[model samples]
Target chain A: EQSICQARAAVMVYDDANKKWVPAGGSTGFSRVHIYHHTGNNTFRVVGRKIQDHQVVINCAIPKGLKYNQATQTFHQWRDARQVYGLNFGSKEDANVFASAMMHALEVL
Target chain B: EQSICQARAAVMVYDDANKKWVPAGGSTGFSRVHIYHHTGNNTFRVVGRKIQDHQVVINCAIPKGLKYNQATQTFHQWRDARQVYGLNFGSKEDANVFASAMMHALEVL
Candidate 1:
């Protein structure tokens, strides 16, 4: 119904083979991302869309610990059972605010 | 006395005025750092020195929570009354290992 938080971020996933982070599929760079409260399904979903055309790319349930990474300006979370996902923000404040909002949603739900 | 752990890391402090991190005074770049158990003072100390000549530069007590910032590849802690200090490691594994050791030391001390 309503979104909890919104941010512009670059999505990445940890590559086990190379031991590094790679961008998520269909995501070239920064995306317009949002965390929404889905009342019908009773779940919180994070959705990401391309800034240029607004084509939806990332759509998934919020995972545990929106862990902040100050150095890389990214927030990491476990998603899709085993995948380690990251959302890199433009600034530390942006990441922290988005994470705080996500944590609040987790606590309420 | 033997140290609990050791690593080569770049030390930095948050410059409140600049709203960013700056290299700690007397620290040029990456230094040989150590976490030691102090018997006489009944405290734990973190010491850092110049790699080229082993000139001690960073010396302080272990503060609360060696907070790891995964994005930045740095571990942050409060020091010198109000300064926010950071130890930037070369890689994720190095930062994780050093933070783990610092947490263990905090728990034991």
Candidate 2:
């Protein structure tokens, strides 16, 4: 519980899924708005979940020029994010933190 | 007649799909080895095609710390890349160039 997920993303609390921290009655899932990046390295894990319609958008300290190259404007929840789309990070420390949180928020099977 | 795609990516040439400048008798296709990035904007168009099995890998001027956040180690060709996987760019210029080339090489519908 020593993580951001411990706090909660999207105002959602982590319920008994043991792998999530989303909104209550959370039918949490996530997906990629875009698979943006120009080369070998990219710098984002831009995924969102829906408590309602397009229920996600966590603003972080993304570095300069670290924006996604593309975005489909389609957002999904944690289930979709985990099965269909996952995430990457700018730094391992931050990345790991987010991963920990996302793990709780997602069904990382 | 004046683009990277027109030059030669991986020694194969762009023949003609009326939109291609790929390997002669070009069966060029590309997929991602990874979709590594961790934020709002990413900077790559990293893709490859095969003249054979797993045919792709072009060396480019990738910026440091911009590595893909994760990689699947799986690759695809243009057809699949277009249908299943597409790409994004760091700048609209580079991005558009790559997109143009891919369009030429791929059956962009």
Candidate 3:
């Protein structure tokens, strides 16, 4: 877990116009990094985070119906039915864990 | 449709190892009464409960793996899958609502 990437800021911030994070710039924590969740605890729980050593994002893929709000820095799964959950947690670990699970669920859907 | 049935007891109980409600005594308020869940509120809700007028202990079907307790009176769905929920609520209405959704989901599955 010698991630070279470091956060530009102490915390992540949202950007309304672009609907993405302010991109906490860093030297790049490896590349093609990914987070994963494997638990179904009412919500979701993250179980993995993968990073490549290329130091460059070789490639990345996200679900089609998934939307991200830079302003809120949140992810929403757009669908006809089923209650998509909102991102809110008492702990950062919780949020990341949930986001990972939800993201995986979305891609599966 | 005057389905004549009533309960000699206040609530359903668990039977543990045998795994079923202790059968709240008295004339079951109806025949084959079932509680259904219709929401996905991180729990199962009972949306429907069916009864029959003939009363002669009509046939009923439940997921084979579902377990019931006589003391605590709870239901658990068994399988090699996601999380199976428990029954607990702040209000009867809440319980019924959740059960409805859960039952519907279970049957659909």
Candidate 4:
């Protein structure tokens, strides 16, 4: 009876060049994210990428149990298998910062 | 325009009864994941789900800037918002293992 019995999360694309977020298209070149439920320990794995005319494409899969915190209106990290991973940003600048920061954090892990 | 500029990630499904990963379907019940971009730092959010006959549905959106490590062939954590979240596995079993372990780790936060 849980409404949350679903797979895959959502994404927001930031157009750095335009300095805005792109709206969701009408499922034309839209990418499909899947969450696989397994035994022993659940693990996250990506399958394929979707694109439009081989341009403006999005790659990767969705990890299970990812939740959004309504309190802060932000996302909270969830677990899958043994390793830990986080989501990325759309803007080029934001992605760069996040990547670097995550790399530093990974060093400690 | 970097190749990675494209948004979103991929997903894989784990078939518990079959005890293996389910193959990707032919975009029928497939779900579309999107990544949005903004200013300052990038953020992550999910949007919609694709289902078959309204059963075995997956929900959510994909965050931007996530990556997978070829060496480990496992996903490494990336950043979007100021917060950090990890991917979840498909199986009902493996999810528990990753969730609990990460919760302990996040306790420091």
Candidate 5:
């Protein structure tokens, strides 16, 4: 059987003051987080994260939209802009594990 | 050729005052939601949802990692602090059927 392709991971920061993640340079208050992995030369699979700092405080994953914007040089507006913790893993399974760990940490804190 | 995967449907909500979902919230406050689609092996392909209610009007999606914590036992933390809806369909289709549905609702409202 052919193995599925995976991507690396990284941490995305959200400056609540600015209401947007760093680097993206937007004014939309801390909406969601995006994890982009280069699949091909200019292709990538996008995932989404939701923000809930003022309520039940759970981290759930959902599908946002998909796109390929050559102008912005990235997959623009693919997911929501809430705060998120990305990871570098060999498979989606590995990524999911890391995500859970982070959640545990948040609960304990 | 092999068929992809799918999951069930559910609704998640956030209460600003109670600081959680209708039933799940801490005094710590309004958080995110979880979308669990049963795959197999008591498994599922969990997507994420992010919340962005107070800033730029654009919605972006990103990878939020994944998980299957058997304690509370939901594919928890697959994403971050935001609100989202669960769908019944493929990896990330049909769900948007109602998502954009509500987005347009909120926008017009």
Candidate 6:
């Protein structure tokens, strides 16, 4: 299967009370993440998956409603209407690569 | 009076029938665009404005739900629930500058 973009990142979650983001699930190390467009029949979802165990972070149709913070090299994507996730990449280049791929994929659809 | 990020661009809109984007208002020349945070009382919206004739492009609260295409140096923002706009910048740097500022502004809010 062809992959669009890949990166190494750590998951994070916002702490509303402290106004900051902390490592999600108390994990701070980077893990492999890749983006792919599902090719199933009648399916139009682009997916962001953690490659370690094929864990899906976000799987949604075009206009995925992603929010990226260049300053912090983080990207936020909603898994569903009520569930959102944040991924913090190790470097700006990695974040940009993933973001660029997502944008290109959207344009293609 | 303060600005967040600024760039030069031409406006575009999606052509659903053609599956492409075309210049908005039949204009292709670059115009100045800048982003700023509105300081009005009880206001919490960050704004993206076209400096030419002081036209407002996207003005909304946090999580403005913007879509950015790095490959084409284009950004899409919804002006309201029913209206969306695409702004095509002259260079990747311009597009990135705007996107970076947007992310940072959202973080600040």
Q: Whose lDDT is greatest here?
A: 1
The residue ranges of model 4 lying beyond 4 angstroms of the native Cα positions read: A1-109, B1-11, B15-18, B22-28, B38-41, B46-48, B51-66, B69-109
Could you tell me the lDDT of residue A64 within candidate 3?
42
Per-model TM-score, in order, reads: 0.43, 0.17, 0.21, 0.19, 0.19, 0.37
Tens digit per residue, CA lDDT, model 6, B1-109: 3676777776554534345554432223355666756665322344444444443434445444444344454654433333345667777788888778767765655
Question: Candidate 6: which stretches are off by over 4 Å?
Answer: A1-109, B41-80
Error of 3 at A81 (Å): 9.5
TM-score of chain B of each: 0.78, 0.24, 0.27, 0.26, 0.25, 0.60
Model 3 lDDT at residue B20: 39
In candidate 2, residue A8 scores what lDDT? 20
Strongest candidate by TM-score: 1
Tell me the lDDT of model 3 at A73: 34
For residues B1-109, write the lDDT of model 3, one tens digit per residue: 1222222111222323234332221112322333432234322322222232232221123353354322233332222122222333334454454345434545554
Which tens-of-lDDT digit does each residue in B1-109 have in candidate 1?
5687777777766655446565543224677778888777657888887675565646777755644344455655555544567788766676776777777777866
lDDT of 3 at A38: 28
User: Candidate 5: deviation at residue B32, Å?
Assistant: 19
- The DockQ of predicted model 4 stands at 0.02
lDDT of 6 at B92: 77
Scored by lDDT, model 2 comes in at: 0.30
Badly placed stretches (over 4 Å) of model 5 are: A1-109, B1-3, B22-71, B74-78, B84-109
Question: Local error of candidate 2 at B8, Å?
Answer: 16
DockQ, per model, reads 0.01, 0.01, 0.01, 0.02, 0.04, 0.01
Residue-level lDDT of model 3, residues A1-109, one tens digit each, is 1222221112212322234322111111212222332244322221122132222211122344666332233332222121122222334454454455455555664
Q: Tell me the spans in candidate 1 whose CA falls farther than 4 Å from its real position.
A: A1-109, B63-75
**Which candidate wins on DockQ?**
5
CAPRI docking class of candidate 3: incorrect
Model 2 DockQ, alpha carbons vs. true complex: 0.01
